[PDB]
Amino acid sequence: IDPHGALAWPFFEARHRELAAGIEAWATQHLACVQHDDTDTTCRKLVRALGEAGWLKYGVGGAQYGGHGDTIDTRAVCLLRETLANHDGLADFALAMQGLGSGAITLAGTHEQKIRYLPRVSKGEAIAAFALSEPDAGSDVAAMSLQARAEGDCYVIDGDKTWISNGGIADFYVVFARTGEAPGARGISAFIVDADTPGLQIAERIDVIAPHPLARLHFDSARVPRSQMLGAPGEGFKIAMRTLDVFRTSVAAASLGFARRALQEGLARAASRKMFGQTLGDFQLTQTKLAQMALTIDSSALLVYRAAWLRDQGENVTREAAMAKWHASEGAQQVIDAAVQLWGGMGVQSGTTVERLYREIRALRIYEGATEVQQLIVGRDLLKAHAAQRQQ
Amino acid sequence: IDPHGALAWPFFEARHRELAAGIEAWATQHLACVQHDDTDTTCRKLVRALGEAGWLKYGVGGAQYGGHGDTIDTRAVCLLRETLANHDGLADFALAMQGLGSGAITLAGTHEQKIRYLPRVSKGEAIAAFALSEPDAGSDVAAMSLQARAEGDCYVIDGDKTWISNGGIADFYVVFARTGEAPGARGISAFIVDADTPGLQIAERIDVIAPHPLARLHFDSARVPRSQMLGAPGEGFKIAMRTLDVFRTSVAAASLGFARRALQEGLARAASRKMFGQTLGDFQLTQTKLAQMALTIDSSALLVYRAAWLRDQGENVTREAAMAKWHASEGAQQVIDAAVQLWGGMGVQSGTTVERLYREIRALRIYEGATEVQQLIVGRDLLKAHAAQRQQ
Amino acid sequence: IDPHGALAWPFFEARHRELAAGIEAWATQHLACVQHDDTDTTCRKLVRALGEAGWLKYGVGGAQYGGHGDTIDTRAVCLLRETLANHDGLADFALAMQGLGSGAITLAGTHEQKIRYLPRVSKGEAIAAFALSEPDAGSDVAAMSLQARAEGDCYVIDGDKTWISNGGIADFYVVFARTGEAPGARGISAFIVDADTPGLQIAERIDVIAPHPLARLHFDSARVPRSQMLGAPGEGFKIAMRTLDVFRTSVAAASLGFARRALQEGLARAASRKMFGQTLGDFQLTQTKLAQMALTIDSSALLVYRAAWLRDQGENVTREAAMAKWHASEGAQQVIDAAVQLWGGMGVQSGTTVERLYREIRALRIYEGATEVQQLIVGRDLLKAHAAQ
Amino acid sequence: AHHHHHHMLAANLIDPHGALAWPFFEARHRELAAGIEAWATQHLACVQHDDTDTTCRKLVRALGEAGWLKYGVGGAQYGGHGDTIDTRAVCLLRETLANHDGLADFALAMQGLGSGAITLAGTHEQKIRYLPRVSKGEAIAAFALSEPDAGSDVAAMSLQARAEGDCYVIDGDKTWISNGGIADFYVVFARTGEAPGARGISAFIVDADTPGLQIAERIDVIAPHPLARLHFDSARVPRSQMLGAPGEGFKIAMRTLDVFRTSVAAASLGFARRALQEGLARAASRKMFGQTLGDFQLTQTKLAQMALTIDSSALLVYRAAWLRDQGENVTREAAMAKWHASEGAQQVIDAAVQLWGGMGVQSGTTVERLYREIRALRIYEGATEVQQLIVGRDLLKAHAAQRQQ
Ligand SMILES: Cc1cc2nc3c(=O)[nH]c(=O)nc-3n(C[C@H](O)[C@H](O)[C@H](O)COP(=O)(O)OP(=O)(O)OC[C@H]3O[C@@H](n4cnc5c(N)ncnc54)[C@H](O)[C@@H]3O)c2cc1C
Ligand SMILES: Cc1cc2nc3c(=O)[nH]c(=O)nc-3n(C[C@H](O)[C@H](O)[C@H](O)COP(=O)(O)OP(=O)(O)OC[C@H]3O[C@@H](n4cnc5c(N)ncnc54)[C@H](O)[C@@H]3O)c2cc1C
Ligand SMILES: Cc1cc2nc3c(=O)[nH]c(=O)nc-3n(C[C@H](O)[C@H](O)[C@H](O)COP(=O)(O)OP(=O)(O)OC[C@H]3O[C@@H](n4cnc5c(N)ncnc54)[C@H](O)[C@@H]3O)c2cc1C
Ligand SMILES: Cc1cc2nc3c(=O)[nH]c(=O)nc-3n(C[C@H](O)[C@H](O)[C@H](O)COP(=O)(O)OP(=O)(O)OC[C@H]3O[C@@H](n4cnc5c(N)ncnc54)[C@H](O)[C@@H]3O)c2cc1C
């Protein structure tokens, strides 16, 4: 109970303070030496262990379906990702994808669809995936071209998805395809596609700078039953956006966890590195660099948990979640870059904490709405609200 | 109550939401056309009007001395300055100086000293001033050279103070002078010096870029009874620092108020300025510029009221208040600068709102602990806490 | 000759080194205590004194018309503005407007037009002005609404221009007006409008944060002879843009001069301000702030004089001049802001050098193509060149 | 009037908007830039990053055979291009090589840094023995200065050199040593004890086969290349192998880093230019929202800032290199160039990664490699903060000199 800790803020309830201590204790006991050599196996083990400890319940909505509660506790999910990321980006990834990959089912699935998938997801017995981006269309989601033609009681799916997290190890994929009811964003549908669907191919595994399971998927005329559709034909675009919206602040929270770890490493190095008859921390320039790192972190944390608290009041957080993800991810890049600088040569030595952080942060500014997209979201929302106030 | 408004945050209590509406109503009624030509007269009028409306009680400690309560409600003082600064810098100045100028009496006065000065300050019937800085020493307070030499039951005060807000119109000054008990910061004493003390002269008024009452004071062997000392001989330096600490977040809150006004002006101009067949707000560069203004404002506001909330819980806020004053004042400069840019030539036209803001914000980064000093305070506190953690 | 000075760079020739020494000596003698109380009178005196000393010849093209050479020496004009701004923004302003206000005549005048106006401009005997912007159209020049209507052998001008530098003291205005040959940027024409033209009204003097002569002009059916048109009907937009192109790097040079003055003041204060048992300059943070000021200054100066040198080789400088004006004006704001900070309370005291610089720099990021417009010019040019390559 | 160029322009030998047209350059620099670009396009089409020991050995030999290692060596009779190092030439070589492949830049750069102390402080006999092979690419050079406990603080190094008879006995460790494990000799800086601190250092030429020299471990960094920790177990080297006088090793170390200060900045610029090329290509071809990525204002102004940073860095680099080539000290100008180019290249590369989206962080893309190749150039040969202090202190030193005069 540190009065200066962020957990003392009135954005949090007692259950969040208890949860934060619980996931930190679990992370210390389980993430001391995570093997990045075989990430497929490591992710499978992480999902199982997270499931067994109860941590995957918070990303699922509906207690009867294995959820922690009938709504998703945004503050809890943020605290889980922030803590896991502080310890190991792969553990954060494994928990995050159980939420994002199943979220469309929480939001739009029928009773039987929820019963079939969400208990196993919440227990860590099924690995989930979210398949939206394509080679020619990532930011421009509304122009996706994965085809889903109706034929009988099923849909025949043709084309590719890429950058699919958990690609190759997921037990099912929530897949968004163009069914063609109307142009652009109005002709998309969403499907639950089991990994063993005939016609579903793992076309290639993708290597990124922070390695984790990632694949390009090819659909070779795959037939999935119409009963596997989430929502109504043409409702897929709003389902995708609503799913991303649930977890947007928790992406910001993961960035914050990486940033906090970078400051931990920068502080330890400043305080211990002897140089020029003193320590690195005795120089003004080091002190103000650390101060800016802490300022950025506190700003990020306040924005993250303002947005999560506000969503947990039942409000839409279009502007506040965009601010948090933008600020936390860009801020984490700045904090980590400063920490690398503080560590000197060791800062770029393979395997060190700050060097791994330098790789884990970079992609978070790109996916789930690149920084530029977040800025536009906030700007347009400001002008939208100004216009509404004027029309009153 | 706007669920997206900052007042909904649980940093605030019900009384703060009522106060925020009340001071906004007062400002709307009373600040419609503030006269910047004769600031002596305007400030005297503002102090009286704020006092009569009860708004000066919040910067005074002790109900029996005219204060709102026995302790300073820092969240309330911040809301007062944020609102007043959002309307007019002179109104914020007038309220702020009644707090800063009397705070050493709230903190260190005897009962008789508090009775003689604080009720009039709280009623707006006596204008307060805080005289610490000198021509040769502003940042380096511990080396101040105003002399106070004991003589019988009085002190003979000799030398200058300068940059003194309300100088020339104040009814009293809290003055810090070297009495010499020990070197440096341990040789300073604090005095209440009535403006009619023989030998206290106004050497000159001072013209600054955002004009307001300001003077160089010449103590020309001015004799002050020993009974006008605040505290014990040699305790003056701590009284000065503790007085500044009380109001540090409120300086951040004034910066935030100026920044909010700038975003209001920038938004109105973006939405209404037709150009290139559309409006200025239709351009991406405008939208991302506005988004960054709002992000800096929300970060600043969260830091201000986190710090104020935490201090109101009875905790020291050395790190949090420095973060707030630093981030809000530097942030407001950037927001205001962006609003000037959006307004084009009108942004530098004398008397327009954003042109005034460009002048009003600049000194806030300099006084009450320049930005560079705030950065060092945060950085040294980070290393102090880190060393305390390592010892454990 | 300081080997570390920018004048030693091979962007410059001997005549530029000699010019820089001459204008610096003139400024040191004539700008020791410029009066900002009555800027109309001060500008009139500055124009005459600059003209008498020969410094206004560099902004005029053609020796028979009073100019130094047959073309405008961009490096020379930049060095003049940089030096004058270093000393006093009003002196920089006075010289700058003699160039900008007369440039369209240098560029597009007939022999008779150049004879009538350029000798007087070069001698400081006619104060020039450039009237382009309007209340509803500044950045969006192509949409201007000042109207020029052909009637017999004259044009009748109705409407407003605003933000007009030297408004109220200029002897003539180069005015751009819609003649309507085609929509938008293709229906504009340029006119020389003498200040004594009946119907031309000084509607309002404008006060800005760094004051200087500035007015809104109202044209109440002002009749100007067709022979006062600069160039052909419909050529006005190109003439306005080409005139701004000529002097664009010299706005960057003025910004650089302001920045250099800010560093001089910041260095002087750092070295002499005693605090905490040492000087302000002994702190790491002061040393790195000073370092960043100097780095921004050298990068701006290299960009300014690269662009000016390139234009003086007879080449277009669309990208390079935009880089210079963008970088130098935004950079000068940062350098000046850092100098204000080093001076503490004195940094915001009216009348100190750094306080004046904080006011003098701000408009330069707005006029003659705001920073955002310069950024788009550069980015579009990069993509244009890439599409060819 | 006068134009800088005329007849060569008429011969279509000069691009007037190119940086090579700047009067900071002579005709020989334009020729060299064209030659090294031709060599790079021919020889660097598919650099293998799997076995960097073998690739670097191949690169050094090929660069030497083509004459490009002569520019980093001083003294024509010893294989150098001229009697002094042509700074502008060495910058152009690194800028071009870095633009193509960081390992080719590395291989050339280390031939210069590794032999630079021999050029500056070597006796006639020392230069004859080492510099011809270096300049031919027949000997791989290395520069052994940093220690686990002392990198920025060179004056605090603890490697020991003990005089014994007419030899010196060396004990202790060096680390972060580029070309460690493949070098034929190391210039080693060790404390000999003539005086405390920066005055008790001496420089030695230490052949790789010197008994007692051990390659303790190979170091893996985010942009992999030959790197090792060296351990000296009572290594005996003759007093004749000392570079300069006893106690002069600190000045020799610092002057060698000075000779090549602008050249690291020039490599940073080559990486940044490549990032802009990739950014423009992606912006012009990536279709989205019914137009291209380059049609958005944000993309245009981001590209504009990338080019602005590049042009500012290039002007700073070649201003400094030109000035040093006139025989002047460039304490302030070279520190500006290294600080700005390295921080600037990081920003340019980061922007190019962002323009490429997911592919920006996909292993093997050009921009992903650049994001890794750039990071260490901000840390070594004077971390950014050290350069800032050099500039700020020089400003104050010059200001004080004027106040006296
Ligand atoms: C580690 C990693 C994991 C991923 N996991 C998944 C997953 O699980 N499921 C899934 O569906 N996708 C996933 N993705 C894909 C990711 O969502 C996309 O990369 C992202 O949507 C950007 O799309 P893109 O790569 O096609 O870049 P592009 O669409 O080509 O955009 C490139 C750049 O253009 C900028 N930009 C975009 N829009 C605008 C605009 N209007 N105006 C100005 N600039 C703009 C942005 O800076 C953007 O980065 C993952 C990506 C990565 C790197
Ligand atoms: C509008 C205005 C109103 C004011 N009202 C009052 C008042 O009512 N009562 C009163 O007592 N004073 C008042 N002041 C004075 C103000 O507090 C001082 O200006 C401030 O303390 C700075 O002191 P200085 O002006 O002497 O600057 P200096 O002490 O000379 O410092 C100049 C710069 O040095 C930098 N600096 C300072 N310390 C360090 C450090 N350790 N390391 C690195 N850099 C450092 C800072 O950037 C600082 O701005 C006012 C000032 C202004 C502008
Ligand atoms: C001291 C001063 C002196 C002046 N002297 C003269 C003179 O002598 N002659 C003359 O003709 N004019 C003069 N002007 C006018 C000046 O050129 C205009 O103010 C300038 O062109 C901006 O036009 P505006 O004020 O109407 O702002 P707006 O056109 O309304 O633009 C406002 C902001 O919009 C942004 N913006 C503009 N275009 C874009 C775009 N495509 N995309 C995104 N953002 C954009 C910019 O940040 C701009 O500042 C002067 C102005 C000043 C301040
Ligand atoms: C790829 C790579 C290759 C290398 N190759 C060689 C080689 O061939 N030969 C060789 O001798 N060395 C080599 N090095 C070592 C390199 O020179 C050192 O890492 C560098 O000198 C920094 O020293 P350090 O790592 O001990 O960090 P530290 O000395 O501990 O400094 C850490 C950080 O503290 C900051 N700092 C330093 N001084 C100050 C100051 N006065 N004030 C404020 N902040 C300060 C800086 O940001 C610095 O980066 C290499 C390093 C790398 C990453």
Helix (H, G, I), strand (E, B) or coil at B83: helix
* Residue D71 region by backbone torsions, left for phi larger than 0, else alpha for psi between -120 and 50, else beta: alpha
Judge whether D178 is annotated as a binding position.
yes
Q: Which two tokens stand for residue A132?
A: 């939206």
* Class at the top of the CATH hierarchy for domain D24-138: mainly alpha
Contact B322, A292 (CB under 8 A): no
Distance between CA atoms of C311 and C208, rounded to whole angstroms? Answer: 32
Instruction: State which amino acid sits at residue A288.
Output: T
In Å, how far are C57, C59, C127, C168, C170 from C120, measured between CA atoms?
A: 10, 12, 8, 18, 12
The count of residues in chain C is 389
| Bridge pairing between strands C130-131 and C172-178 | parallel
E-assigned strands of chain A? Answer: 130-131, 147-151, 154-165, 172-178, 188-194, 200-205, 214-225, 229-230, 274-275, 278-279
CB burial class (10 A; 0-12, 13-18, 19+) of residue D6?
exposed
Helix (H, G, I), strand (E, B) or coil at A204: strand
Domains of chain D, by residue range, sit at 24-138, 139-246, 247-405
> CB of B144 closer than 6 A to ligand 2?
no
The dihedral built from the CA positions of residue A334, A336, A337 and A338, taken in this order, carries a sign that is positive
Chains that touch C (3 or more CB pairs under 8 A): A, B, D
Task: Tell me the chain A residues in contact with residue B289 when contact means C-beta distances shorter than 8 Å.
Answer: 379
* C-alpha neighbours within 13 Å on the C-beta side of residue A44: 8
> CB of C273 closer than 6 A to ligand 2?
yes
Q: Which two tokens stand for residue B306?
A: 């986190």
Distance between CA atoms of B66 and B120, rounded to whole angstroms? Answer: 8
One-character DSSP codes across A58-123: GGSB-GGGT-SBSS--HHHHHHHHHHHHHH-HHHHHHHHHHHHHHHHHHHH--HHHHHHHHHHHHT
Q: Which two tokens stand for residue B170?
A: 């104040």
Contact B76, B16 (CB under 8 A): yes
Backbone angles phi, psi at C379, to 5 degrees: -65, -40
In the CATH scheme, what architecture does the domain A244-384 have? Up-down Bundle (1.20)
Contact B280, B270 (CB under 8 A): yes
For atom 27 of ligand 1, the residue with the nearest CA is D357
* Class at the top of the CATH hierarchy for domain D139-246: mainly beta
Instruction: State which amino acid sits at residue B92.
Output: D
Tell how far CA D60 is from the center of its chain: 15
Among 1.20.140.10, 3.30.470.30, 3.40.50.720, 3.40.50.300, what is the CATH number of D247-405?
Answer: 1.20.140.10
D287 contact partners, CB below 8 Å, separation of at least 6: A136, D293
Contact A97, A129 (CB under 8 A): yes
Q: Residue B149 carries which DSSP code?
A: E
Does C276 lie at the interface with A, CB-CB under 8 angstroms? no
Task: Tell me the chain C residues in contact with residue A284 when contact means C-beta distances shorter than 8 Å.
Answer: 283-285
Strand partners, D215: D230
Instruction: State which amino acid sits at residue D189.
Output: F
**Active site amino acids of D:** 381
Backbone angles phi, psi at D289, to 5 degrees: 55, 35
Distance between CA atoms of A135 and A188, rounded to whole angstroms? Answer: 17
Distance between CA atoms of A314 and D286, rounded to whole angstroms? Answer: 38
Helix (H, G, I), strand (E, B) or coil at C168: coil
CB burial class (10 A; 0-12, 13-18, 19+) of residue C18?
exposed
* C-alpha neighbours within 13 Å on the C-beta side of residue C291: 26
> CB of B345 closer than 6 A to ligand 3?
yes
Q: Which two tokens stand for residue B370?
A: 């320049």
CB burial class (10 A; 0-12, 13-18, 19+) of residue C33?
exposed
Helix (H, G, I), strand (E, B) or coil at C68: coil
* Residue D15 region by backbone torsions, left for phi larger than 0, else alpha for psi between -120 and 50, else beta: beta
Mark yes or no for CB contact C288/A283 under 8 Å.
no
Contact A188, A19 (CB under 8 A): no
Q: Residue D221 carries which DSSP code?
A: B
Residue to mutate among C134, C136, C145, C209, with most B CBs inside 10 A, is: C209
Spell D189-228 as b/e; 16+ CB within 10 A means b.
Answer: bbbbbeeeebebbbbbbbebebeebeeeeebebbbbbbbb
Residue with tokens 């921390």: A281
> CB of B351 closer than 6 A to ligand 3?
no
Distance between CA atoms of A90 and A31, rounded to whole angstroms? Answer: 10
For atom 48 of ligand 4, the residue with the nearest CA is A344
In Å, how far are C5, C41, C88, C93, C137 from C81, measured between CA atoms?
A: 18, 20, 10, 8, 28
Q: Residue D180 carries which DSSP code?
A: T
**Active site amino acids of B:** 368
Distance between CA atoms of D213 and D232, rounded to whole angstroms? Answer: 5
Instruction: State which amino acid sits at residue B175.
Output: V
Helix (H, G, I), strand (E, B) or coil at B233: coil
Contact C164, C203 (CB under 8 A): no
Task: Tell me the chain A residues in contact with residue B376 when contact means C-beta distances shorter than 8 Å.
Answer: 284, 287-288, 291
Q: Which two tokens stand for residue C317?
A: 């400088």
Q: Which two tokens stand for residue D193?
A: 């004890």
The dihedral built from the CA positions of residue C22, C25, C28 and C34, taken in this order, carries a sign that is negative
* H/E run at residue D404: helix D384-404
Of A156, A160, A151, A161, nearest to A129 by C-alpha is A161
Contact D80, D86 (CB under 8 A): no
Q: Which residue does chain B place closest to D300, by CA atoms?
A: B285
Spell C57-96 as b/e; 16+ CB within 10 A means b.
Answer: bbbbbbeebbbbeeebbbbbbbbbbbbbbbbbbbbbbbbb
Distance between CA atoms of C331 and C103, rounded to whole angstroms? Answer: 27
Instruction: State which amino acid sits at residue B114.
Output: K
Does A287 lie at the interface with B, CB-CB under 8 angstroms? yes
Q: Which residue does chain C place closest to B372, by CA atoms?
A: C285
For atom 29 of ligand 3, the residue with the nearest CA is C139
Of D42, D45, D49, D47, nearest to D68 by C-alpha is D42
Angstroms from A82 CA to nearest CA on chain B: 19
Ligand nearest to the CA of A96: 1
CATH number of A8-127: 1.10.540.10
* Residue A206 region by backbone torsions, left for phi larger than 0, else alpha for psi between -120 and 50, else beta: beta
| Bridge pairing between strands B229-230 and B188-194 | antiparallel
Of A94, A99, A117, nearest to A47 by C-alpha is A94
Contact D317, D355 (CB under 8 A): no
Task: Tell me the chain D residues in contact with residue A285 when contact means C-beta distances shorter than 8 Å.
Answer: 385, 388
Contact B238, B176 (CB under 8 A): no
The crossing angle, in degrees rounded to 10, of helices A89-108 and A111-122 is 160
In Å, how far are B136, B285, C139, C379, D276 from C372, measured between CA atoms?
A: 42, 8, 10, 11, 20
Q: Residue D47 carries which DSSP code?
A: -
Tell how far CA C183 is from the center of its chain: 29
In Å, how far are A369, C251, D64, D70, D133 from D136, measured between CA atoms?
A: 52, 51, 4, 7, 5
Task: Return the CATH superfamily for domain C128-243.
Answer: Butyryl-CoA Dehydrogenase, subunit A, domain 2 (2.40.110.10)
Backbone angles phi, psi at A277, to 5 degrees: 70, 5
Q: Where are the alpha helices (DSSP H) in chain B?
A: 14-30, 39-52, 74-87, 89-108, 111-122, 236-272, 284-312, 318-342, 353-360, 371-391
For this PDB entry, the determination method is X-ray
Resolution in A: 2.0
Instruction: State which amino acid sits at residue C215.
Output: A
Interface of D with C in 301-320 (CB under 8 A): 301-305, 307-308, 311-312, 315-316, 319
